[PDB]
Design a protein around this ligand. Structure first.
Ligand SMILES: Nc1nc2c(ncn2[C@@H]2O[C@H](COP(=O)(O)OP(=O)(O)O)[C@@H](O)[C@H]2O)c(=O)[nH]1
Length: 353
């Protein structure tokens, strides 16, 4: 009857009490889900993070959207530049000799102008170059050199991007690229769950092992660029880019970190692969490959090759998905599915009321 007084028990409980110690019961957050984003560089880790914001967080604001303009220009510049350098590297002829002096004037401008800026004289040079048949012949051969996968996407809409008062569309943002070595993080809610997602870069460089001691990691999301199978190695390294991604994934399953962690394979860039597979045989990456060179069988073949690297017999623990990170609708499906696997396999006791 008396709340501040008390009326229960019999000389068992005395002195001051600690139910405000049982406040750590409220600190019990099993609705917290930590995911590591691992994978080679340029495999789509950042893009996934961006998507998480677009889909579950509030999408990018107009102030944020405008902060990409400067990276989106650099991205475009860097891209045309890469093509132009490959004109000489692959020794490809300009469609119209006159376009050769534009390309010379570009090297000049690029080295002078302010990083992130796209002056009208530059974009005109770039717009012509793009329409040139030489550049286009060189563009189709992007596989023989280092080219942003977003190069085309941007150079196709270059005009739309230099019209004053330009606003980056969600896709544009999604297509941008900013190399980092450290860790990008993002926190968002979904399904009454707080998600903390960690994008871990510098895997081919440092390959830090402290990542293991990270506590509370529900699942590992490992990205692979499907469209990397095509890239020829001038490195002479034992394994091209596809087999390099495999060597990185091999040490993710090979590593016997015992905290309960599901691993999820994102075979990313399925859209670009769908274009490549018809032209470039999957035998380029796997010579033993007897199957046909089509999206279904080749994609599957690659998936297998990755799943087959599974060192520890992970009892119902290797999940995989063909993904297109820049495609929101797609990511919304894959992440729905991932969540559904998380909540079941790593389940807190069910509420049931
Ligand atoms: N077409 C296509 N482009 C993608 C996809 N994922 C990423 N990209 C682009 O590929 C480039 C490299 O991706 P990024 O996230 O920067 O790679 P990171 O180095 O792993 O962070 C960027 O220009 C992205 O816009 C994808 O699924 N499809």
């Amino acid at each position: 009857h008396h709340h501040m007084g008390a009326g229960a028990s019999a000389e068992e409980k005395h002195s001051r009490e600690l139910e405000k110690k049982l406040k750590e019961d409220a600190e019990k957050d099993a609705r917290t889900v930590k995911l590591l984003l691992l994978g080679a560089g340029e495999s789509g880790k950042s893009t996934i993070v961006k998507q998480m914001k677009i889909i579950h967080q509030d999408p990018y604001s107009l102030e944020e959207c405008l902060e990409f303009i400067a990276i989106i220009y650099g991205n475009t510049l860097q891209s045309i530049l890469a093509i132009v350098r490959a004109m000489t590297t692959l020794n490809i002829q300009y469609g119209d000799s006159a376009r050769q002096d534009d390309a010379r004037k570009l090297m000049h401008m690029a080295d002078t102008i302010e990083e992130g800026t796209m002056p009208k004289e530059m974009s005109d040079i770039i717009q012509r170059l793009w329409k040139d048949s030489g550049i286009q012949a060189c563009f189709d051969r992007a596989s023989e050199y280092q080219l942003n996968d977003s190069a085309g996407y941007y150079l196709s809409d270059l005009e739309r991007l230099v019209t004053p008062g330009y606003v980056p569309t969600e896709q544009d943002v999604l297509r941008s690229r900013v190399k980092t070595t450290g860790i990008i993080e993002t926190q968002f809610s979904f399904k009454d769950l707080n998600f903390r997602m960690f994008d871990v870069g510098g895997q081919r460089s440092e390959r830090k092992k402290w990542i293991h001691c990270f506590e509370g990691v529900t699942a590992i999301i490992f990205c692979v660029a499907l469209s990397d199978y095509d890239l020829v190695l001038a490195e002479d390294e034992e394994m091209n880019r596809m087999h390099e991604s495999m060597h990185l994934f091999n040490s993710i399953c090979n590593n016997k970190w015992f905290t309960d962690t599901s691993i999820i394979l994102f075979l990313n860039k399925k859209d670009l692969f769908e274009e490549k597979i018809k032209k470039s045989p999957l035998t380029i990456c796997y010579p033993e490959y007897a199957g046909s060179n089509t999206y279904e069988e080749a994609g599957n073949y690659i998936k297998v090759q990755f799943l087959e690297l599974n060192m520890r017999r992970d009892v119902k623990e290797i999940y995989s998905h063909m993904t297109c990170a820049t495609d929101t609708q797609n990511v919304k499906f894959v992440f729905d599915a991932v969540t559904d696997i998380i909540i079941k396999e790593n389940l807190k006791d069910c509420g049931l009321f």
